[PDB]
Amino acid sequence: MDSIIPAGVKLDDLQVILAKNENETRDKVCKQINEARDEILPLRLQFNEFIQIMANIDQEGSKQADRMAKYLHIRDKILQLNDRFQTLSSHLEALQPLFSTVPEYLKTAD
Amino acid sequence: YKNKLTVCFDDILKVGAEMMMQQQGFSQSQQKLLKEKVKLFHGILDDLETSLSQSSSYLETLTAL
Amino acid sequence: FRKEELLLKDLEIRKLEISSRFKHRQEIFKDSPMDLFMSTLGDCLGIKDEEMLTSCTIPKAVVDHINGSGKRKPTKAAQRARDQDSIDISIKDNKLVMKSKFNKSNRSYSI
Amino acid sequence: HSLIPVAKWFVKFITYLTQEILILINDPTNKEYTLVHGIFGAKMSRTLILSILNEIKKVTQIVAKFPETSYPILNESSTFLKLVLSESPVDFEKFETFLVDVNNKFIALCEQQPSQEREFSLLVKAEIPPEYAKVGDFLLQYANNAVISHANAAAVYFADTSGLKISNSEFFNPEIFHLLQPLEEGLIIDTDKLPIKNRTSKSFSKLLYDDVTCDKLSVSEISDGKLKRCSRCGSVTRAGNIISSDKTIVPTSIQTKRWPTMYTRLCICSGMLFEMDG
Amino acid sequence: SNSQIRLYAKFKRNTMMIQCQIDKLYIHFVQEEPLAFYLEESFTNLGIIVQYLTKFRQKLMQLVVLTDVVERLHKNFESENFKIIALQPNEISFKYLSNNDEDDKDCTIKISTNDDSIKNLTVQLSPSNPQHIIQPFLDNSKMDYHFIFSYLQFTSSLFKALKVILNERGGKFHESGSQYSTMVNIGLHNLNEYQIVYYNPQAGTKITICIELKTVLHNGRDKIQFHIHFADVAHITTKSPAYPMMHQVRNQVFIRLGNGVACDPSEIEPILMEIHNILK
Fold this sequence. Notes:
The PDB classes it as transcription. The entry lists the keywords Divergent transcription, Mediator, RNA Polymerase II, PIC, Pre-Initiation, Activation, Transcription Factor, Gal4, Gal4VP16, transcription. The structure is cut from a larger assembly and holds chains A (110 residues), B (65 residues), C (111 residues), D (278 residues) and E (280 residues). Chain B has two helices and no strands. Chain B has 65 residues and is mainly alpha-helical. Chain C has a two-stranded antiparallel sheet with strand order 1-2.
C-alpha cells in the first residue's frame, strides 16, 4: 500500500532517511518479516492437508451430496490459496523497494 | 520467485490434467511427476524462506552499521 | 444377442462423446485451470452443468455465434460443421448445456 | 483378460531375484541368502524362461499382426498386455541376455573339468561346492554390470515384492507353524490335540491370495465355500469353478468355463484338491 | 479441629513412579509404608461433601492415566538415559536423551485430563534440545501417542548426531579466522523425512542430504530404515567447482547400492559422523 521507500532513490539517500524518524519504518518492516515468517509454516501445513484430502478421495464417501459438500469445500480451499498467494505477492512487493538496494550494494561492493 | 509459486500450483493441476484425462490404473510416470512437483514446491518454499531470513539479517546489520 | 451389441455401441458412443467433450472443454475454458478442473471433476462425478457454479464469466460473442439467432445469421458451413460434430453444443445464460442424444435417462458418470 | 493377474506375479517374481543381486554384493558371506545361486544355476530354468520370453514375443507379435478390429472396446485386454511388458521396472530384453550368458559360461566350465555333482548342486542343493569357490565369485561380479545398468537401482531395492508365497512361513498361520508334539509321540497328530481356534482347515493357512491365477481373493469368493485347499502343500485355490461377474471383462451372467478347470481334482504339486469346509 | 479432609490410599505393587517427585500434585506419601499416600483438602460447614469427593476423584483419574502413560513409556522407552525429572499434575518433565543438565527437561508433555482419560498429549521440546524443530508437525497432527514415542525413540540417535553437527558450527569464537562459507541448517518437509542442506553464498553452491523413512522388504518382513542419500537432482557433473567433495563422498561411501544408504538407527550415529568426518 503505502510507499515508504521511494522508487529510484539511491542507497545512501535511503541510509540517511533511515537514520532518523525513530525507526517507525524499521518497526513496520520487522512486523512484516515476522508475519511472513509466521505465514510460511501454515501454508505448508494446509498444503499437506490438501494433499492428504486429495489422496483420501476414495474414502468416507457414500452419498452424492457428500461429494457436493466435499468438492465445494476444496474449491473454497484453493480459493483462499489464491487469495493468500495474492496477499504474499502484496507483502513481497511492499518489501520490493527495500530489497532493491541489495543488488546495488552487492554490485558496488564487487 | 513470484512466477515460480504461481506456475507450481498451476503445474500441479497441469500435471494432474493428464492424470484425470485417462480417468476421464495410474501411470507411474505421472505419479513420479507429481512426486517431484510436490517435493520441488516444498524445496523452493524452503529456499524462499532462507532467502527471506538472509535478507532480513542483512537488513538489521546494515541498519546497525 | 442384441443386449451386448447395444452395450458395446453405447460404450463406443460414450467414448467418442467424451473425446469431443474434452477437446471442446480444453479450448472453451483454456484461461481458467480452476474452471477446467472443477468442470471435468464434476462431470466425472456426474453433475449436470445447470447446477455447478462458475467463478469467471465467458464472453457473449461465442454465445451469439454458436446459436446465430442474433443479428448475424449462422453460416451454412457452420451448420454443416455443427451437424458433423457428435454433440449439440450451446450456451444459455453463461452456462452451456449437455444432453445425451441416445439415452435420455440419468446417465451416471461416477467411477 | 484372465492372464493379466498371472502376469503380475510373473513380473513380481523376477524382481525378487534381481533384488537379491544387489543385497548379496555387499555381504557375500551371508549363508541365509544362498538360494539366489541355485535359481540361476538350474539349466532348464534359464531355457524355460527364455521359452516363456519367446512365446511372449510371439504372442505380442501375433496380437500386433492380428489385432481385434470389430469391437474396439475389447482391445483393452490386448492393449494392457503390451503396456504391462513395457511398464515393467526392468526391461525383459536386458534380463533375457542375463540368463543366456550364464548358460554359455556354465557349459565351458564343464569342459574345463568334468563333474556331474555340479548339475545336482545347481538344481537341488542350490549351493556351489567348496572346490568351485572361484565360480561363486563370478556370479557376484558379473550380475552388477549386466542388467542393473539399464534399470533403476533405487526403485528395485525398495520395491514391494512381499507376499510372493514362496516360503512356508507365509503359507500356514503362525499359531501352528511350530512343532506341537515330541518326536517320541510320533509325527502324526490327532485333531483333538490342536488348539480350539486351530481345529479347522480354514484357520490352517493364509486365505488371502490365489495360487493358480495369482489373483487377490475378495470377501465374496472367501465366503461362498467354493474354494479348494491342497492336502499336500497347504495351497488354497478357487480353481475349477465359475468366476464371479466382477472378475470378467464386463459384468454379465454368462457362464464361461475358464482354464482353472484343469486343476479341478489335481493340485499344482500333484496333490488332491478338496472342497474347503465352512 | 484441623478442618481438613485427608483421603488415604495405597498402591497394590511397588511401582517405581513413587520414587519420582510427585510433590507438584500436593500428595503426601506415608513414611512407615512407602506404597501408601494421601490426597488433602480443607473445608467450611462440611455438608457439601461432593466438592472434596469430585476433586479427589479427578486427582485419582489423573494419577491413574499418568501411571498408564508411564507404564506404556517404560514398555516403549527401554533405554539407559530414560529418567523423570519433575512430576506435575498438568505437565510431564522427563529426560530420555544424553543431556548433562539435571533440571533441563528434554521432552515436555502437557497433561489435559478428561473424566476418563487424557484429552490430548501435546509433546513440547526444549529449545536446547535439537528436537524442537519438529514441534509444529507434532502439534498440528493428531497421531497416536505410542507412535510418537516410537518415532522419538527411533530417531533419538539421529537427533543427537545432528545436535553434534549443529553445535560444531554453533561454537563461539575460538580465536580462529576460519570464517567458513558453509552454514548448516535443517530443511523439513513432513514427519516422514528430515533434510539437511549446506548453504554457501560465497561459492553459490548447495549440498543437500535427505533422510527419508522408506520401507524395505527383509526376509519376508517389511522394515523401516533411514534412507540417507543424495537427491536425484544431484546429478552433478565433474565440471562443478564444489563437485570434488560430493565425488569424494560418493567414492568413499557409495548397505550401499550406488545412491542410497539404508542404515540401522543403532548404527546411524557413527556412520553419519563418518560422513561428517569428511565434512569436518
